[PDB]
Amino acid sequence: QYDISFADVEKAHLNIQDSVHLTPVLTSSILNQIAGRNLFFKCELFQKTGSFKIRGALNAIRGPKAVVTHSSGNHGQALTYAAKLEGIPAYIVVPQTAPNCKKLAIQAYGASIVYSEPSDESRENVAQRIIQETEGILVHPNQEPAVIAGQGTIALEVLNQVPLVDALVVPVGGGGMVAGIAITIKTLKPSVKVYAAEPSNADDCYQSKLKGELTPNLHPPETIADGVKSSIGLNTWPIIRDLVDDVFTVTEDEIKYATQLVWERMKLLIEPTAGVGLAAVLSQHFQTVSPEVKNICIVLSGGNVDLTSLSW
Amino acid sequence: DAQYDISFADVEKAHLNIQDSVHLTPVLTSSILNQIAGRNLFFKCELFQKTGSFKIRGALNAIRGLIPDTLEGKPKAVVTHSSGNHGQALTYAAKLEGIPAYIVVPQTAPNCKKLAIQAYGASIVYSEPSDESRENVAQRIIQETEGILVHPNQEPAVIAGQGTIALEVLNQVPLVDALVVPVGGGGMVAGIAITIKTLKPSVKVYAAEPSNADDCYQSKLKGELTPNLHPPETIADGVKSSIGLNTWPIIRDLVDDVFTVTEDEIKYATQLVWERMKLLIEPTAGVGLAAVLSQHFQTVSPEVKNICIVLSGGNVDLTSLS
């Protein structure tokens, strides 16, 4: 047993497969050619709300005076979405350095926005400060086990969509998605590698694997990947420890290079957090992954990006 | 003499000629866009095509047509004039086939397209942004290189290649009711019309065009070719060309209607795809959606429900905006 069950994943599928897009897998010949593998992009940027976070947010909501949470943007959008549908008012704690377009999008989704400082701590606290003030319930971005169940239903889709899939490269923050995916993937096929991808400026998931024990960022990460700044937690760590095959960390310049490659060559408007998976596959350290592993599916997790970035 | 410069047999042959090198691009949908439009829209995603637009189909078909059974008589060089996208596609096509490319590009053509043409290894030669200057400069470069002109939209093999878009859509959307196609020189909408009217003429073919460059509209009203008096100025930089002698007769006979759209309408539809579909189209590719959202398209019968819009390109500067 881990915090969520295989069973909890299918019930989440059936609980959200009525308002959730079975998003496409797109491919790319020029990108297949720079990798030297056969890349398959799971396009979760096309999802309702702009990222995969509608799954866990719907499933948490289905499966209250208010609902409250902390977000850099995505969960705060997919929660406020799934809660507006049930008439429930919503409060969203969002770091002050957090993306301006993910802020404006949360208010336009109806909810009250309250600014915190950028950290797992300031967030996880200015969150319970509103809970006390509103008597609302909390829905947690990656540790709440309904939310973790919502995201494993990415993995079911990928197994059909890519019949002959060799590896799933997944961006990790709190690890809700990559853990939720490993709970699902590793049962049905264990010759399917599960690689985690993560910026070097925020390498708690790599450090934890190196150390063999939960090793969170103790300084707030400075990284262009605004959506993976969160540390992995207690529920999701065990799964990452046992079922994730490796972790690949990437520099700011690798993330920026690979996100620009998806914009320019694939014409997909991903947020830079979604370029981390590809960054990992194009890395010096990935060029030594067994040439047997050919069929790499990369999760493009979101497209909630401000149409005016540092244009860097 | 009843024959147009191409038939459907040319399109099926183009498909064979190129299918091994061009992507069979997806047809994506958006429930929020269907809501705004009040129709079921199907976005044929030619921005995912190689070189970032559909132009690779025609440029590759024409190239392949120029190469004989032995190496003898193969072109020394290929020459064209282009606002950027045909230049790219021809350079890439010529590169696969080991032929040198010389592209004549207007100075005022987008920088990203100029950079792309150079990245693929062409020599770029600059002209004024007019139909006439593009042609005279390209004729100078032909006489100097002993090269062969592959015209952006009047060459039959290019028209035939762009028509393979319609072959795929017909497969991808079984109960398609209409195609909407941006029109500049008309190679693309002529090859589509030919293909759609030959196989399933109950499907509508509609041209979409900026009102700032409405020579297709005005030519259809008059019943004769009537180009733009002045070079057209519009944010839809891919469709400033005028229609020509080879595409005019097909557009005349087989294109059902022409919808013109304002600059603001093009801007708005383009932003709507970027934000709502997360698809990086260039403004010329928002012309078809602008047209479906226009006041005037409101008189398209409610029976014309399943509308396929060709998103023809994704070649836009990322740092450049407004």
Ligand SMILES: *Cc1c(COP(=O)(O)O)cnc(C)c1O
């Ligand atoms: C939340 C998020 C992730 C990572 O999910 P975790 O469960 O936090 O690992 C990756 N990409 C995007 C765009 C996200 O919003």
Ligand SMILES: *Cc1c(COP(=O)(O)O)cnc(C)c1O
């Ligand atoms: C060239 C082009 C068109 C117009 O094609 P024509 O055959 O000249 O009508 C439309 N959209 C894009 C992106 C183009 O590059």
Ligand SMILES: [Mn+2]
């Ligand atoms: Mn981390």
Ligand SMILES: [Mn+2]
């Ligand atoms: Mn015109």
